[PDB]
């Protein structure tokens, strides 16, 4: 299954490679129970996130669009 | 309050004065239905 979602890279994880940080955040958020629909599986393989990321009012973190592998 | 447990609810940060206004309008027969939207710009 191909899923594209927005990942919130916090300011302290700046200067590291985007892909590893994004996959770490996705694994932390989606390690188990997935979401209510499209399965409850715990599997996740990898991801690739775009370099450019948005900055929103009141938040210093950077929001990147990333496509990733689940194991539904 | 209406949907029970079957619906999903999202947190929104607003002024409590606006919530008071919404509840005072709801004490009337006015029915304000707040429409949520993505916090990110999405695009």
């Amino acid at each position: 299954v191909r899923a594209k979602g927005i990942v919130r890279i916090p300011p302290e994880y700046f200067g590291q490679s985007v892909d590893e940080i994004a996959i770490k955040i996705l694994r932390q958020e989606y390690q188990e129970k997935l979401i209510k629909d499209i399965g409850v599986v715990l599997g996740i393989v990898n991801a690739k996130a775009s370099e450019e990321g948005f900055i929103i009012f009141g938040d210093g973190a950077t929001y990147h669009e990333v496509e990733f592998d689940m194991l539904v | 309050p209406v949907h029970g447990d079957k619906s999903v609810l999202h947190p929104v940060t607003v002024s409590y004065a606006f919530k008071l206004l919404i509840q005072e309008l709801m004490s009337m027969v006015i029915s304000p239905r707040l429409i949520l939207g993505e916090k990110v710009n999405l695009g």
Binding site: V1, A3, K4, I6, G39, V41, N46 | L42
Partner: peptide, 27 residues
Amino acid sequence: SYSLKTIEEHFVPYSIAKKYIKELIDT
């Protein structure tokens, strides 16, 4: 902040699920 959209979804391979979980454990 977390908008999930599934595109071109593929079925979970039962035979290759062991390989996928082994790769995940390796990672």
